[PDB]
Design a protein around this ligand. Structure first.
Ligand SMILES: Nc1ncnc2c1ncn2[C@@H]1O[C@H](COP(=O)(O)OP(=O)(O)O)[C@@H](O)[C@H]1O
Lengths: 280, 94, 374, 294
């Protein structure tokens, strides 16, 4: 009668071998799975979001194969190596397949400044991936996405030479990759920025599909020029906290730490005859 | 079936569901892809041959079992035979 | 007020307490049992009553069939309750009911006809001047010094959790669960039959209940404790039966209360008490969640097992959101607290408008209690 | 009773059932009669109406996270516009959580939340508020169909009677520069003296109304007409394949407890939302849907 599963299972596990910041990154990427499940973008596991734990130790966290994005938790995540070897397995009695990690592995070998890579297979983004001139910035959200890189995809990248062409086409500074006929890939230093860019590019693709359907041609549309378009909050910091807070209000045990408190909590009305609280 | 619908045949239930799901996700790919594509222009195509050339459940069993796990959380009481009864193992000896 | 004090009578499912309002201690606490003889009496001149009530019945356990008038928080024998009330008023306190007001406590969710029958019995036969009905779980928070918090209550009848918000009992979020002390006693029999000790009559149920009261504790971790009990015999203790035999309880001491946390041992499909409290807080609005997590009071007879407090705190921490203020406030006198709250409530001067007069009942029938007492 | 804590989700669009389950817990009428030294009965009533409008906008999916803002006027003797604080999600908005600010963006009432308001996002509403003393409610919306309608050259076309009921549509071109005071002047020029619907090109759709019901009616008609146009202009491919309705002929032929011109849909959806359990406390024109049984 409920799909609701506590996203924090670190206390009930009380096992495994963890890094000094690993247990927060696990909860963050589990929450990313929960958001992408809730919007209806993805349901079936195809190794969508990958996160790098540390710059030196590698040991990238991925979802196990066979578990739908609704059922992924913190303890179910699997820490794998760059080649596909199992560094650490969580409490998930499933066969281990690291085939889908190969798509993220050469991007790990290409750019280190990225930690979070999100791959999509939504119908709108896959239609844009088949759209030969790519994303046309006729909307504000596509202007907010930024620059794109386009790469031909033959469906395989185990080959030693295909990696060179992939990292050639990605470029030195480009955080959105569009594989032809294979959806889109978003690239972010934090999970927040990557999730923000995923949402904005998905909205832009949804706008563009309807626009190209309704207009019937490029000339029926208007395109503002890229040259004409041309405290501190990080790119995804502000929105992601609101989403985590709302899931906390519903009841998911999100382990994301909030930078500032929500409510003032005016002091309540105190009586002296209270039994002193707590069990000590 | 032209102007009628879609038919998928399979050796097993899970394989047939796999084939029909791949076909329907293909058709909502094609419908929203072909809107601005006029003829050979405005289209990207993949050669089937050179792309195809490129426990231990077969095709669709993982698929259909995951959907059955989704259905049993709603109290459907289906009784589908799961290869794995639970996502987590049993607790250790402690 | 000054001349006459209202009678505070707490009718628990297992025990009955009675005293005068404004006093610290109840005058009489006795088991709520009624026994009938089961064997033929041949001594002509020693004197045998038709039925024994209360402590006199529990003294002669061997020759009686003990019956409980209250079953699962629902009265199943009303004339038996007339007997227990007659025994309370006339024998334990030696005061007439027609000269003092009375105060009655009740479960948070009971049928309407039960309240009507209690009012009709209390006015028609005893002819009390004034009576009032209070929710059992509300008075515990008054005894706690609090007006906002969640109250968990567990007696011999039923275990329920309620939220209270400046004296308001939210009717939607009150949750009920059938894990009482009697079921724990029955499970104690069911696990005692493994060692080789057999108890089957209603007389030995009091012996098993005394064993449960004296030799039990709650494990902080069940899986580690089973291995600890299997490894060594330092957990075993001996109990000395009324006939002189000595039994060794051993492993079962932390297996009896564990049915509270995992009801699957008893065959019930319901969730544990910690999940019940968690869901009870989950059903309320967001604004009062912070002062429900930061304010929890335990009450009832079952909640005096040693080590229940830390286990309850850990299990409710495991379900709460992160960086959440969690504290459990368990008074040492947590299963005399309902009578204390009743006497406190009867002591106030603005409480005297709550009393239902005899003329009001005579005018409006037994249905006036629901309109007068919301 | 017998209801799950969270509602089970559809195969697509879990936001609807999720915000439904959140609104099951959080009431939108957060006020219960506590001390309020600055509140008025009309101010509190409009606060409840604005919170209900925010929740209704979230419920239909007419929302793009928090990047859209809806402002209303207290109709006090000086300024005092109500806006959502910057950061809270639309399903989190309550009556006491709304923030009263001035015309230039100065916070006169910090509200019940510590989150400040977005200073940049209020200038677009402030241009409309300075443009017209008649306007009282400004709604900015972003639906994909409306964005596709705004992105085309021709814009809205008279193909449905609902678009004819919309009337003249003001068009604001996408500058994309946010040049402040002259941007306000250009908004005042493009909007004109009298207009009901504004389309800010490639970004969003704006409805302005003297009341909340009027703005809701206008934005609903605009969105439904836009998604009418999306399919048929796609299938047409040209003027030779599309029938255009004549505006003047159609408008000439087509034309207290009594309802206004836009209170019917608002009251019906308020009945729906109170049957859900949001307990908004909105004053209905008629307290019961049907007569009491006799
Ligand atoms: N000192 C104690 N240690 C352990 N259990 C106790 C103790 N005192 C009472 N109990 C348990 O509490 C139960 C009595 O609950 P009680 O407070 O009479 O319920 P009610 O709230 O209906 O009055 C008994 O069955 C007994 O098992």
């Amino acid at each position: 009668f409920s799909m609701m599963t506590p996203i924090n299972d670190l206390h009930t596990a009380d096992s495994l071998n963890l890094a000094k910041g690993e247990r927060l990154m696990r909860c963050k990427i589990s929450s990313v799975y929960r958001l992408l499940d809730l919007y209806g973008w993805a349901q079936l596991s195809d190794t969508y979001v990958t996160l790098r734990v540390s710059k030196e130790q590698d040991h990238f966290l991925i979802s196990p194969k066979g578990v739908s994005c609704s059922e992924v938790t913190a303890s179910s995540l699997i820490k794998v190596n760059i080649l596909g070897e199992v560094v650490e397995k969580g409490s998930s009695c499933f066969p281990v397949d690291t085939t889908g990690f190969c798509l993220h592995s050469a991007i790990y070998a290409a750019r280190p400044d990225v930690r979070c890579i999100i791959h999509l297979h939504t119908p709108a983004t896959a239609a844009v991936s088949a759209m030969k001139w790519g994303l046309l910035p006729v909307s504000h959200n596509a202007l907010l996405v930024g620059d794109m890189a386009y790469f031909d995809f033959n469906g395989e990248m185990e080959q030693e030479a295909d990696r060179i062409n992939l990292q050639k086409c990605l470029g030195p500074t480009c955080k959105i990759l569009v594989l032809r006929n294979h959806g889109v890939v978003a690239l972010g230093d934090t999970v927040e920025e990557a999730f923000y860019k995923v949402f904005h590019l998905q909205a832009a693709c949804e706008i563009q599909v309807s626009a190209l359907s309704s207009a019937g041609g490029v000339e029926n549309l208007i395109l503002l020029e890229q040259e004409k378009h041309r405290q501190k909050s990080r790119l995804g910091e502000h929105e992601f906290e609101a989403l985590m807070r709302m899931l906390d209000n519903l009841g998911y045990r999100t382990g994301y730490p909030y930078r500032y408190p929500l409510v003032q909590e005016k002091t309540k009305h105190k009586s002296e005859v209270e039994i002193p609280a707590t069990v000590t | 079936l032209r102007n009628h619908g879609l038919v998928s045949v399979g050796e097993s239930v899970e394989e047939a569901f796999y084939y029909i799901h791949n076909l329907v996700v293909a058709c909502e790919i094609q419908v929203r892809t072909l809107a601005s594509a006029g003829g050979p222009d405005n289209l990207v195509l993949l050669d089937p041959g050179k792309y195809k050339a490129k426990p231990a459940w077969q095709i669709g069993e993982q698929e259909f079992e995951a959907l059955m796990r989704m259905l049993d959380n709603l109290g459907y009481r289906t009784g589908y035979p799961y290869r794995y009864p639970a996502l987590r193992e049993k607790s250790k000896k402690y | 007020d000054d001349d006459i004090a209202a009678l505070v009578v707490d009718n628990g499912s297992g025990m009955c307490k009675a005293g005068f309002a404004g006093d610290d201690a109840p005058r009489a606490v006795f088991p709520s049992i009624v026994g009938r003889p089961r064997h033929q009496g041949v001594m002509v001149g020693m004197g045998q009553k038709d039925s024994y009530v209360g402590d006199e019945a529990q003294s002669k356990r061997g020759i009686l069939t003990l019956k409980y008038p209250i079953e699962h928080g629902i009265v199943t024998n009303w004339d038996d309750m007339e007997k227990i009330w007659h025994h309370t008023f006339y024998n334990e306190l030696r005061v007439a009911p027609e000269e003092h007001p009375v105060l009655l406590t009740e479960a948070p969710l009971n049928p309407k006809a039960n309240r009507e029958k209690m009012t009709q019995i209390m006015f028609e036969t005893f002819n009390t001047p004034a009576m009032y009905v209070a929710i059992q779980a509300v008075l515990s928070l008054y005894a706690s010094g609090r007006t906002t918090g969640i109250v968990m209550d567990s007696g011999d009848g039923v275990t329920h959790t309620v939220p209270i918000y400046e004296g308001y009992a939210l009717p939607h979020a009150i949750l009920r669960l059938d894990l009482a002390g009697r079921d724990l006693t029955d499970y104690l029999m069911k696990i005692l039959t493994e060692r080789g000790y057999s108890f089957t009559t209603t007389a030995e149920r009091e012996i098993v209940r005394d064993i449960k009261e004296k030799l039990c504790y709650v494990a902080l971790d069940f899986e580690q404790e089973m291995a600890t009990a299997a490894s060594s015999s330092s957990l075993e203790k001996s109990y000395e039966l009324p006939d002189g035999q000595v039994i060794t309880i051993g492993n079962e001491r932390f297996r009896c209360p564990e049915a509270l946390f995992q009801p699957s041992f008893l065959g019930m499909e319901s969730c544990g008490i910690h999940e019940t409290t968690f869901n009870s807080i989950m059903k309320c609005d967001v604004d009062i969640r912070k002062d429900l997590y930061a304010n929890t009071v335990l009450s009832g007879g079952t909640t005096m097992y040693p080590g229940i407090a830390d286990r309850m705190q850990k299990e409710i921490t495991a379900l709460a959101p992160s960086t959440m203020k969690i504290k459990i406030i368990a008074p040492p006198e947590r299963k005399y607290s309902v009578w204390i709250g009743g006497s406190i409530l009867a002591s106030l001067s603005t409480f005297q408008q709550m009393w239902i007069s005899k003329q009001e009942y005579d005018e409006s029938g037994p249905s006036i209690v629901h309109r007068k007492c919301f | 009773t017998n209801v799950p804590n969270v509602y089970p989700a559809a195969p697509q669009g879990g936001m609807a059932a999720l915000n439904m389950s959140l609104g099951m817990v959080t009431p939108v009428n957060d006020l219960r009669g506590s001390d309020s030294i600055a509140y008025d009965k009309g101010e509190k009533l409009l606060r409840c109406k604005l919170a209900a409008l925010y929740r209704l906008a979230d419920l239909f999916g007419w929302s793009h996270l928090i990047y859209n803002h809806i402002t209303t006027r207290v109709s006090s003797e000086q300024e005092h516009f109500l806006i959502v604080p910057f950061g809270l999600l639309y399903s989190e908005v309550t009556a006491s959580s709304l923030v009263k600010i001035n015309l230039q963006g100065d916070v006169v009432d910090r509200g019940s939340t510590n989150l400040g308001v977005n200073q940049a996002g209020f200038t677009l509403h402030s241009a409309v508020y300075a443009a017209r003393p008649d306007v009282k409610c400004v709604v900015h919306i972003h639906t994909p169909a409306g964005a596709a309608v705004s992105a085309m050259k021709c814009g809205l076309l008279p193909i449905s009677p609902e678009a004819l009921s919309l009337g003249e549509v003001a068009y604001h071109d996408y500058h994309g520069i946010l040049v402040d005071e002259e941007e306000k002047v250009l908004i005042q020029k493009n909007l004109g003296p009298k207009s009901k619907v504004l389309i800010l090109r490639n970004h969003g759709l704006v409805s302005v109304g003297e009341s909340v019901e009027e703005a809701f009616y206008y934005i609903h008609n605009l969105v439904v007409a836009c998604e009418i146009q999306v399919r048929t202009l796609a299938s047409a491919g040209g003027p030779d394949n599309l029938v255009l309705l004549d505006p003047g002929k159609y408008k000439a032929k087509s034309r207290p407890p009594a309802w206004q011109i836009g209170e019917q849909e608002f009251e019906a959806l308020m009945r729906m939302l109170d049957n859900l359990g949001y307990r908004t406390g909105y004053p209905y024109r008629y307290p019961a849907l049907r007569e009491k049984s006799k």
